[PDB]
Design a binder for this molecule. Structure first.
Ligand code: ZN
Ligand code: ZN
Lengths: 200, 200
C-alpha cells in the first residue's frame, strides 16, 4: 500500500506534466490543499519532492512555482540524458539476451506516437541490466522530458528522421557493438534536443 | 521547515550509511516506530524512499531489509558513477571560471581522509553548472558509495595513487581539455571500484 503523501504527489505530478497546470504557474498551497482536503503536514513532503525533480521551483518569499521550462533547463535535462541513454546502449549491447533483441525488433516494426518512442527506449534501458539507471531515466528524467514535448510537439519531418535513427541503434545493439550504439544514441538524443530548441 | 516524514528519513539513512545498522539487517518496522514514536502513516513514505535509493530492499512476505552490499550492486553503482562523474569533468573544463579552478587547486594542496576526496569531487560537480547532476551524484549515488567505503576502507597505498590521479584531473580541467578530463575521471573512478573489489 501507498501513503497519502505519495498519492498527492503523483496526482500533482500528472497535472504538471500533462499541462493542466501551466508552466510558471504559482502554486496556491492552502488553496490546492482544499482541492484534496489534506493537511499541510504531508503536503510539504510532496512539494519538496517535486522541487528535487525540478518540476517545481522554490521562490523565497512567495512559495512554489511551476518550473520555467526555459532553455537552460532544457540543456540541463539533455546533458544527463545524453550520458545516461548513451551508456544504457553500451550496456544493452553487452547484456541484452538474444530473445530480448528480437522483442526490441518487433516493437519497432509494429509502430512503423510519443509512446512508441517510449517503448523503444524503455526496453534498451531495461536491457542495460542496471536498475538505478531505470530509476533516473524512466522515473525522474522522463517526467521533465514529457512536459517539454507536450508544450512543444515534434516537427512534421521528425518522426521519419527519428525512426531511421532507431533502426540504426537497434542494429548496433544486435551486432553487439556497444561503442557504436552509444555514439548513435548520443546523436539521436542530440537530434531530439535540437527539435525542441527550434520551437522555443 | 521540514516535515516529520523527512526527519525520520535522514536519521534512518545516516544509521544505514554509517554502519549503525548492519548490511542485510531486517528492519523491524513496528519496533523501529517505537524508537521514534511516530505512526506508520508517514513511516512507509520514508522506507519507500530508501528502497528507491537502493539503501533498503523490499522482501515480499517479510518486509524491508538493509541492502546486500554485494558485488552486483557495486557494479551497478560505479557504472552510473563513471558516466556521471565523467561528463561532470567535461562540463567543468568547459564552464568552471578561472577563480573556480584555483579554489579547486587550494583544496588539493592543503589536503596534501575520505572527506578530502569528497571536497575535490564536489567542486567539480558544482563547477559542471548542472544542478540535476549534483542531485544524482551528491544526493543519491554518494550515499551508497559512503557505506561501501565504511565497510571496506582503502588499501594502504590507495591515497597516494588517488592523490596523483586528482592532480592530473585538475590539470586537464585547468587546460580546458574536457575530453582528457572525462577520460582521466573514468580511470580514477574505475581505480576506486577495483580497490573495493579486492576486499570483497
Ligand atoms: Zn527516440
Ligand atoms: Zn577521488
Amino acid at each position: 500500500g501507498e501513503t497519502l503523501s505519495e498519492h498527492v504527489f503523483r496526482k500533482i505530478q500528472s497535472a504538471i506534466v500533462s499541462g493542466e497546470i501551466a508552466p510558471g504557474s504559482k502554486i496556491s498551497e492552502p488553496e490546492l490543499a482544499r482541492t484534496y482536503g489534506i493537511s499541510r503536514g504531508p503536503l510539504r513532503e510532496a512539494i519538496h519532492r517535486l522541487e528535487g525533480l525540478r518540476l517545481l521551483v522554490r521562490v523565497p518569499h512567495v512559495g512554489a512555482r511551476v518550473v520555467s521550462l526555459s532553455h537552460a533547463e532544457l540543456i540541463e535535462l539533455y546533458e544527463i540524458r545524453e550520458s545516461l541513454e548513451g551508456m544504457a546502449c553500451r550496456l544493452a549491447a553487452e547484456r541484452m539476451s538474444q530473445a530480448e533483441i528480437d522483442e526490441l525488433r518487433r516493437v519497432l516494426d509494429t509502430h512503423e506516437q510519443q509512446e512508441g518512442d517510449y517503448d523503444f527506449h524503455y526496453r534498451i534501458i531495461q536491457g542495460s541490466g542496471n536498475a538505478t539507471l531505470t530509476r533516473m531515466l524512466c522515473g525522474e528524467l522522463y517526467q521533465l522530458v514529457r512536459m517539454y514535448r507536450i508544450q512543444y510537439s515534434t516537427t512534421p519531418n521528425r518522426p521519419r528522421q527519428a525512426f531511421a535513427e532507431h533502426h540504426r541503434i537497434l542494429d548496433a545493439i544486435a551486432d553487439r557493438d556497444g561503442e557504436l550504439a552509444e555514439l548513435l544514441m548520443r546523436r539521436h538524443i542530440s537530434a531530439s534536443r535540437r527539435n525542441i530548441e527550434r520551437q522555443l
